[PDB]
Amino acid sequence: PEASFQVWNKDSSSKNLIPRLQKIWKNYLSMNKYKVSYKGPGPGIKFSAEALRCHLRDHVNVSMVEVTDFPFNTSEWEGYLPKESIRTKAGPWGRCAVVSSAGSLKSSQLGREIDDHDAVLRFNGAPTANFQQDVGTKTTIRLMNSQLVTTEKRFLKDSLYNEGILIVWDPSVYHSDIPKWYQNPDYNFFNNYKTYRKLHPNQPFYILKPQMPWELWDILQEISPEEIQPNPPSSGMLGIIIMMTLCDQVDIYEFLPSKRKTDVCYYYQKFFDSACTMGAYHPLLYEKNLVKHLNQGTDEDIYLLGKATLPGFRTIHC
Ligand SMILES: *[C@@H]1O[C@H](CO)[C@@H](O[C@@H]2O[C@H](CO)[C@@H](O[C@@H]3O[C@H](CO[C@H]4O[C@H](CO)[C@@H](O)[C@H](O)[C@@H]4O[C@@H]4O[C@H](CO)[C@@H](O[C@@H]5O[C@H](CO)[C@H](O)[C@H](O)[C@H]5O)[C@H](O)[C@H]4NC(C)=O)[C@@H](O)[C@H](O[C@H]4O[C@H](CO)[C@@H](O)[C@H](O)[C@@H]4O[C@@H]4O[C@H](CO)[C@@H](O[C@@H]5O[C@H](CO)[C@H](O)[C@H](O)[C@H]5O)[C@H](O)[C@H]4NC(C)=O)[C@@H]3O)[C@H](O)[C@H]2NC(C)=O)[C@H](O)[C@H]1NC(C)=O
Ligand SMILES: Nc1ccn([C@@H]2O[C@H](CO)[C@@H](O)[C@H]2O)c(=O)n1
């Protein structure tokens, strides 16, 4: 007979959520922090995985702030941004993994498998020490939010960040261009970005353009059958899109949860929070519908391995 088990439900909505997280979702809708007014095609639209993958390649500009973008062409910013394009510095690569920071990675024994990709993406302060056998040992790209660069004093100190290519991103006002964003960043990380840059001139450190997270959000809101949190996508979703721009194959682990689904928010932290898996601030719930929708793997691969497989943009149709 055929096995019965549960993997992520592609049509997850707020009505599936715990009432606790339902109120939180509702409240973020209300305090429209980023002054979002969705004016696109309208809540709820169906795409084939082939078409949506191609609607994603075409309508999201994965690009980094360059020294041509005002005011990063001014004297104070001289020599601060990387000379070369990230695409020059990064691959293009063949096998790539995205390591989510979920607690569900604990005792998953993915460490060797994750190490067998040409390049590995991790987030924020997710550490390697003590976790090699569950998480891997290699860090090629690390995507971080601006809050960590602004406020985490460990960012300028801990030897871990000093591995691979770094990227910082910052939530802007909805549809804001670079100069408006620069004047009003969510966190003021510019000082610390500069200060790091002085410390490690050799290691490539990029700033994501503020437009990218909202371009991805538009598609989310357009897909979902209801209003999603008007806050940018999680680092995890942006990281998926990024690696898709740089890889043929992206294997993404414990984003879609395995059977090890747990309230433990992070593998390196000890505190419990269901919201880390299901979403509170980020529209994480709808991102996972998406990743589950584009998933080219089996449902068994999700149950056992927490593994989704999405193909990279380089290998797509029309
Ligand atoms: C992600 O990031 C993406 C990249 O940044 C981004 O994509 C960009 O989107 C923009 C839209 O938002 C889009 O902007 C348009 O740009 C047009 C010009 O582009 C050309 O120059 C830019 C320079 O930046 C370049 O990037 C682009 O590629 C174009 O270069 C051309 O490249 C061709 C390559 O294919 C090349 O052709 C090749 O040549 C080869 C030679 O061997 C070979 O032959 C190849 O086979 C051949 O293909 C070509 O030579 C070259 N051309 C040039 C000039 O360099 C603009 O035209 C356009 O502006 C118009 O539209 C906007 C609205 O969109 C209007 O506001 C604006 O006013 C313009 O409207 C025109 O207005 C004039 C004047 O009023 C009108 O003229 C009248 O016409 C009448 C009838 O004709 C009559 O004559 C009257 O007398 C005239 O007065 C005209 O009709 C109006 N047009 C229209 C349609 O109404 C616009 O700015 C940009 O191109 C995109 N970039 C890329 C790379 O795709 C993307 O948006 C980002 N994603 C997200 C989600 O944000
Ligand atoms: N329990 C968790 C914790 C985190 N995450 C994903 O991992 C990224 C890094 O924090 C987050 O941005 C999020 O995408 C997750 O899916 N589940």
Ligand nearest to the CA of 124: 2
* 3-state SS assignment for residue 142: strand
Ligand-binding site membership of 130 (annotated): no
What residue owns the CA closest to ligand 2's atom 2? Answer: 102
Q: What is the DSSP letter of 64?
A: B
Residue 266 token pair: 């992070």
What residue spans define the domains of the chain? 1-318
| Distances from the Cα of 110 to the Cα of 32, 223, 252, 253, angstroms | 39, 32, 11, 9
Instruction: Tell me the CA–centroid distance for residue 43 and ligand 2, in Å.
Output: 25
How remote is the C-alpha of 195 from its chain's centroid?
24
Instruction: Tell me the CA–centroid distance for residue 208 and ligand 1, in Å.
Output: 25
**Distance between CA atoms of residues 181 and 218, nearest Å:** 18
**Distance between CA atoms of residues 148 and 75, nearest Å:** 26
| Distances from the Cα of 10 to the Cα of 152, 290, 295, angstroms | 35, 7, 10
**Which residues, listed in sequence order, are joined to residue 169 by a DSSP beta bridge?**
145
**Distance between CA atoms of residues 19 and 91, nearest Å:** 44
How remote is the C-alpha of 58 from its chain's centroid?
18
At how many Å resolution was this determined?
Answer: 2.1
Task: Identify residue 118 by its one-letter amino acid code.
Answer: D
Ligand-binding site membership of 281 (annotated): yes
Tokens 């357009």 sit on residue? 222
Query: Phi-psi category of 28—alpha, beta or left, where left has phi over 0 and alpha has psi -120 to 50?
Result: alpha
Length of the chain: 318
**Distance between CA atoms of residues 246 and 298, nearest Å:** 24
Tokens 């941004």 sit on residue? 81
Ligand-binding site membership of 15 (annotated): no
DSSP string, 160-228: GGGSSEEEEE-PPSTT--HHHHHHS-SS--HHHHHHHHHH-TTS-EEEB-THHHHHHHHHHHHHSSSPP
Which helix (H) or strand (E) segment holds residue 286: the answer is helix 284-294
Task: Identify residue 243 by its one-letter amino acid code.
Answer: M
Peptide bond into 92 cis (omega under 30): yes
Dihedral sign, Cα of residue 194, residue 195, residue 200, residue 203: negative
Of 61, 64, 68, 245, the one to substitute when testing ligand 1's pocket (max ligand atoms within 8 A of C-beta) is 61
**Which residues, listed in sequence order, are joined to residue 121 by a DSSP beta bridge?**
98, 141
* 3-state SS assignment for residue 98: strand
Phi, psi of 179 (to 5 degrees): -65, -40
Instruction: Tell me the CA–centroid distance for residue 198 and ligand 1, in Å.
Output: 39
**Distance between CA atoms of residues 260 and 17, nearest Å:** 19
Ligand-binding site membership of 9 (annotated): no
Ligand 2 contact via 93 beta carbon (within 6 Å): no
Q: Are 145 and 170 in contact (CB under 8 A)?
A: yes
Of 167, 276, 289, the one to substitute when testing ligand 2's pocket (max ligand atoms within 8 A of C-beta) is 276
**Distance between CA atoms of residues 166 and 204, nearest Å:** 6
Ligand-binding site membership of 4 (annotated): no
DSSP string, 222-268: HHSSSPPPSSPPPHHHHHHHHHHHHEEEEEEESSS--TT--SB-BSS
What residue owns the CA closest to ligand 2's atom 14? Answer: 236
Helix, strand, coil percentages in the chain from 3-state DSSP, rounded to 5 = 40, 15, 45
For 1-318, give the CATH class: alpha beta
The CB-based long-range contact list for 160-164 (8 Å cut-off, 24+ gap) reads: 160/125, 160/127, 160/128, 160/129, 161/125, 162/200, 162/203, 163/139, 164/139, 164/140, 164/203
Give the CA count within 13 Å in the CB-facing half-sphere of 188: 3
| Distances from the Cα of 238 to the Cα of 23, 32, 123, 178, 283, angstroms | 25, 21, 11, 18, 12
In Å, the largest CA–CA distance within the chain is 69
Task: Identify residue 220 by its one-letter amino acid code.
Answer: L
**Distance between CA atoms of residues 276 and 87, nearest Å:** 30
Ligand 2 contact via 236 beta carbon (within 6 Å): yes
Q: Which atom of ligand 2 is nearest to the CA of 234?
A: 12
CA dihedral 24, 30, 35, 40 (to 10 degrees): 90
Give the number of other CB atoms < 10 A from CB of residue 99: 28
